[PDB]
Amino acid sequence: QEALKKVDATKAYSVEEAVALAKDTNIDATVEVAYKLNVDPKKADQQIRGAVVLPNAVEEVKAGKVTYRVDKAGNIHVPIGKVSFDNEKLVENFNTINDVLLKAKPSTAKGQYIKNISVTTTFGPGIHVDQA
RNA sequence: UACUACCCUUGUGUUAUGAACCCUCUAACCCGCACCACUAAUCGUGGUGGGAGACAGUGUCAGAUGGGCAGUUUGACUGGG
Ligand SMILES: [Mg+2]
Ligand SMILES: [Mg+2]
Ligand SMILES: [Mg+2]
Ligand SMILES: [Mg+2]
Ligand SMILES: [Mg+2]
Structure with a gap:
């Protein structure tokens, strides 16, 4: 129950803080990047x-290729491993994901491109962040 | 199918804001209401009550009405016209 409470919803954790506490916030579970x-x-x-x-068709089918595709809700979220x-x-893994998603930019985007950004798992509560 | 979150339509709430509208207030404005003083003054200015009251009045802008008023128009040919 309290795994939903221990996470600091107020704070924008860094990438490192987020992946570290993702190990705790499981009580196995695939970590999940999420952009809105x-x-x-x-x-x-x-x-x-x-x-x-x-990194953590053998190069694709076996090497752990995860697919990303934004849904109608504008919420594109992808696994990055257990x-x-x-x-x-x-x-x-998040460097790979964030770099490829930022460099796959639709050029017609606005002043802001990421409305919200967070991490979760198969039993991970939301861990919101501020792109760093 | 459980469960985690990213969440999305729909409609409930808290809070902050913006408008419209009704009532309430009085402190602006007003009283050809009373009393006091200036003061011998049916003026006026102040003061104290009372009444109305953010309306009215005034200013600006706009719409309707407007011979109440004003300025003007109201052909030529033509066995007169
Ligand atoms: Mg009279
Ligand atoms: Mg006339
Ligand atoms: Mg003339
Ligand atoms: Mg003639
Ligand atoms: Mg004739």
């Missing part, structure tokens, strides 16, 4: 989509 976007998810020009390997993975390796 400023784009229009209901138009073809902004249907963000793709797939990328977690809580039993090393936390700096989770930082590397």
Whole structure:
């Protein structure tokens, strides 16, 4: 019950803090990056989509290719591996995800591109962050 | 299908805000209401009560009405016109 309470909903944890406490907030569980976007998810020009390997078709099918694709809700969220993975390796996984998602930008975006941003797991409560 | 969150439509609430509308207040404005003083003054200015009251009045802007008023128009040909 109290795993939903221990997490500091007020604070924007760093990537490192987030992946570290993701190990705790499980009571096994796949960690999950989540963006809520400023784009229009209901138009073809902004249907963000793709797939990328977690380093932590053997290069794709076996190496741990996780797919990302934004839903109609504007919420694109992707697995980045289990809580039993090393936390700096989770930082590397999120580096992969964040870099590829930011560099896959629809050029017609607005002043803000990420409305909200957070982490969860298969039993992870929300861990909101501020892109750093 | 459990459960975690990213959440999305729909409609309930708290709070902060913005408008419209009704009532209530009085402290602005007003009283060809009373009393006091200036003061011998049916003026006026103040003071004290009472009444109305953020209306009215006044200013600006706009719409309707407007011979009450004003300025003007109201052809030529043509066996007169
Ligand atoms: Mg009279
Ligand atoms: Mg006339
Ligand atoms: Mg003249
Ligand atoms: Mg004539
Ligand atoms: Mg004639």
